[PDB]
Structure 1
Amino acid sequence: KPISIIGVPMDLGQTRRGVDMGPSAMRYAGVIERLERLHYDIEDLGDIPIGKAERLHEQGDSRLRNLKAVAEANEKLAAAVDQVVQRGRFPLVLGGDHSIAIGTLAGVAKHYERLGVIWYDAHGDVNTAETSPSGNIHGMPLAASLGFGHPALTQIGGYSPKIKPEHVVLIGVRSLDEGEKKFIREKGIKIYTMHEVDRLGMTRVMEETIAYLKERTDGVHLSLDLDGLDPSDAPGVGTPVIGGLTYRESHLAMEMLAEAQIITSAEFVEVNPILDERNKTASVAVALMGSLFGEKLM
């Protein structure tokens, strides 16, 4: 299936500037060339125009920083993504902080009876204005897409929820706020924290993950946050957490998903060139994209 790249230069979902440079950092890391080599009909639809956020002061919720700019950008993203899917193409969204997942899922989900989600991340991203300790919207996209949160975020695309909790699998988690641990526990979301990764091994985690979703979804969206990898492998992220997944574990995961042929959409987020070591993180993202799309060693 032909691919369509959409860049979302977003940084309003959090506070470290530079994550808005992720789309071009990955383009510069050679994402087009990489995918063209795999004989893909790759197309670059450019970037979603993001508006500058109103200053905190006259702005409404500190528990929902930059809500309007974030909500509007995601509206545009949802539309762009919706059209790509309608055109029969695979939407590959490049971020940008994780709050863009709200728009990506808003444009994809409407097209599936039961869309599953693989949330590759160090965080759960299931906070609300009530549970969020930062007010950073990049820490709320999964909950908002599950129908939990401010209507400005939950109603993107004119419908909700975008997905069901039983159709979500979290991988590489190692930093959850108390409210989030409770949310995960109660909504019954499937999750493999680093303990399970260390205990079971990435192979078993991926096998179980793929089998689980394949048995109850009709499309799977890969929401890959680069901070899911160890800061040593992916240094250029705004909210890094030590003791993460390795470069190899990430490739195996992508390779196993490629093989499974279950990934119907994807987004690579949180790449921040301004916090990286010579574009290393964008590079990792591009390599991981290659594996996801079927690149093989043999």
Structure 2
Amino acid sequence: PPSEAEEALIKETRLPLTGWQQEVDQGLTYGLEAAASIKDRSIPTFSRGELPHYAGINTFMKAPYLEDVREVGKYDVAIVGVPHDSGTTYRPGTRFGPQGIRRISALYTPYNFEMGVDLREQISLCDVGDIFTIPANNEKSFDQISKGIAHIFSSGAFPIILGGDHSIGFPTVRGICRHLGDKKVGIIHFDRHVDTQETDLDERMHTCPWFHATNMANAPAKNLVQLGIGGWQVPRQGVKVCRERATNILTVTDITEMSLDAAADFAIARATDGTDCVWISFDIDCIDAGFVPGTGWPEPGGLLPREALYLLKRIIRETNVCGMEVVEVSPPYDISDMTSLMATRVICDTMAHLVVSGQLPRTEKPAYIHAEANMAVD
């Protein structure tokens, strides 16, 4: 058989360069041709585009900033920041998650070697900026989040949420469910922590999103899949809810003992049994603490990066994904954006798996998207 590297070289030949040339051409018009001493005449005077990586205004992957969010339906993918840390029960700082992710994403090119995907050539991506979150009122912030996510989801753009603490899992899923009609969504949750209790410190904090999301008819708790649960921070109150609502859990040791392929098989089967789409909710703290210091609830003995990324390869390519959030990156506790980088990799890999599996670009709005918002979903 050919190696992955040998296939990668062949796949690269199949990718076009029209998106690259478009950016070069616009850069030369809007940034001027370079000074006379520059030999490569694709270089402008003012950086306009990907290069140099260390320069420029940092939107996610230097995607266009879409100021007018009413136009978001014109894009295959919309990156949206949710700078919300009012749900944090230990360290705050994840209100800057979106900023750290955007900053470090400038290191990347739009191309993935192993998969032969070039997002600049194969999808349209925009960055719509951030939800106007409300630090002093978690519930008001939830209402802002749901309205913005509902707007993006109903437009047909695929939403990728930069968190923000995990409490946002309730208002993001609520925003989706406002436009699901009677369709059902399975939640695939990567986390050490079950996040299923009712209240924490008198409010609906990051330990509580799935209690409230699975109270909605569109999100069955029996289709909630929780990958990586364990350690010393899993609240007993949440465990009780998982047991009584019959959620689907694998610990880290379950995953490594059964094999990653069997663990992914479990997640796919359980999340899709009686649902129409799947929501991916990736808590960066599911990765062993040694790789993600910039997070509020680090825990040793988590998933290693290649394990988490392989699980994503299986799950994203084999389910109908309606959106994703990557939560709990907390830049004030990070070192050289290590944790933001891990989150960026999850986001970019996910987009590439959606391309490989033919889910993006979409040729039509998915059947599960309903234009009228059901404001009584919760």
The reply on whether 1:43 has 2:126 as its aligned counterpart is yes
The reply on whether 1:257 has 2:310 as its aligned counterpart is no
| Cα drift, residue 38 of structure 1 | 6.3
Contact residue 258 and residue 294 of structure 1 kept, 8 A: no
Q: Please name the residue that 1:57 is paired with.
A: none
Q: Please name the residue that 1:84 is paired with.
A: 152
Q: Please name the residue that 1:24 is paired with.
A: 99
Contact residue 5 and residue 46 of structure 1 kept, 8 A: yes
Amino acid at match of 1:21: F
Amino acid at match of 1:273: P
Q: Identity of counterpart residues, as a percentage?
A: 26
My pick for the range that moved more, 225-234 or 171-180, is 171-180
My pick for the range that moved more, 209-218 or 246-255, is 209-218
Query: CA separation of 1:185/1:163 partners in 2, compared to 1, >3 Å: closer, same or farther?
Result: same
Alpha-carbon RMSD across the aligned residues, in angstroms, is 2.2
Instruction: Structure 2: state its 5+ residue gaps.
Output: 1-74, 111-117, 357-378
Q: Please name the residue that 2:220 is paired with.
A: 164
Between the two proteins, the alignment pairs up a number of residues equal to: 268
Instruction: Structure 1: state its 5+ residue gaps.
Output: 54-68, 148-159
* TM-score for the superposition, normalised by structure 2: 0.67
Decide which of 164, 186, 189 is 1:119's aligned counterpart. Answer: 189
Contact residue 230 and residue 241 of structure 1 kept, 8 A: yes
The reply on whether 1:186 has 2:244 as its aligned counterpart is yes
Q: Please name the residue that 1:154 is paired with.
A: none
| Cα drift, residue 166 of structure 1 | 1.0
* TM-score for the superposition, normalised by structure 1: 0.84
The reply on whether 1:233 has 2:308 as its aligned counterpart is no
Deviation by residue 1:55-82 (Cα, 9 ceiling, x = unmatched): xxxxxxxxxxxxxx11111111111111
My pick for the range that moved more, 17-26 or 217-226, is 17-26
| Cα drift, residue 33 of structure 1 | 5.5
The reply on whether 1:285 has 2:343 as its aligned counterpart is yes
What is the distance in 1 between the residues matched to 2:204 and 2:320? Answer: 31
My pick for the range that moved more, 13-22 or 244-253, is 13-22
Q: Please name the residue that 2:208 is paired with.
A: 140
Contact residue 110 and residue 162 of structure 1 kept, 8 A: no
Deviation by residue 1:132-162 (Cα, 9 ceiling, x = unmatched): 4786711111111122xxxxxxxxxxxx345
Deviation by residue 1:18-47 (Cα, 9 ceiling, x = unmatched): 211100111112179648446321111111
Q: Please name the residue that 1:213 is paired with.
A: 271
What is the distance in 1 between the residues matched to 2:339 and 2:76? Answer: 25
Query: CA separation of 1:91/1:116 partners in 2, compared to 1, >3 Å: closer, same or farther?
Result: same
Higher RCO (CA-CA < 8 Å; seq separation 6+): 1
What is the distance in 1 between the residues matched to 2:268 and 2:121? Answer: 23
Amino acid at match of 1:201: S
What is the distance in 1 between the residues matched to 2:341 and 2:297? Answer: 18
Contact residue 223 and residue 272 of structure 2 kept, 8 A: no
